[PDB]
Amino acid sequence: MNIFEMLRIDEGLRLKIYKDTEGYYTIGIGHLLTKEQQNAFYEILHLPNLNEEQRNAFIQSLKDDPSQSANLLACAKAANDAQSLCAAKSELDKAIGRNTNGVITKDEAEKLFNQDVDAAVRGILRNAKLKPVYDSLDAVRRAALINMVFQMGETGVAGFTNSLRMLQQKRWDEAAVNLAKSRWYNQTPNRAKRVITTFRTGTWDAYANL
C-alpha cells in the first residue's frame, strides 16, 4: 500500500482514453490531456477543430439541401469531436513516447501519475493556505491531502479552513468529525470516509479490505 494504490482505488485507473461528462479527455488516474437552418450554417462554420475543406463539404452540403440542417449539424459536431480525440491521443503520445492510439499500460499510467503528484505538491507548496498544513503532516496523511487535491483541486481543498487547521494542530479526531459534516463527504461518502479515516489514523487501514 502506497499513494498510487490509494488513488487507483479512489479515482479509478483507465487504460483507455475517456471523455468527461464535462468534456475533458482523460486517462490513467485523472490525467487530463486536452481542454433553424440559420444557426445550422453558423455553428458548423464556428467549430474550432475542422479543416477548411472539411467545413467546405459540410457548408456546401447544407446549401445543396437546407432542410437537412439537423443532420449536417450532427455530422459537423461528430467531426469536431473526432478531432479533439485525435489531439488528445497526440498529447498522450508525446507523454508516453510511442503511438498509443489512446491506450496505455498500468506502469505507463503510474509514470503519468507520479509526475501528476509532483505537480500537485508543487502547487500545494505554493499555496499559502495549504503549505503549512502539508509540511506538518506525515507521508501517509500527506497522501490523504493530495488525494483530496486530485478530486477537487487545490482551491477547493484550500477552502476547508477549519478542518485544515485542526489537521495542522494534530487534532485528528476533531478533524475527522469536521470533514464528515462537509458537502464533499455528502457527495462522495465512501471515498471521503476512507480519506477521513486516513487523516484520523495516519494509516492505510481504510484500504485493507476492500
Residue numbers in the entry: 1 to 35, 1219 to 1266, 38 to 164
What do the authors say?
Here we propose a novel method for connecting the pre-existing α-helices of two proteins into a single extended helix using a chemical cross linker. EY-CBS (3,3′-ethyne-1,2-diylbis-{6-[(chloroacetyl)amino]benzenesulfonic acid}) is a chemical cross linker that can react simultaneously with two cysteines in the i and i+11 positions of the α-helix19. To test whether EY-CBS detects the formation of a helix, we chose two amino acid residues separated by 11 amino acids in the proposed fusion helix and mutated them to cysteines. In conclusion, we have developed a new method that can convert two pre-existing α-helices into one long extended helix.
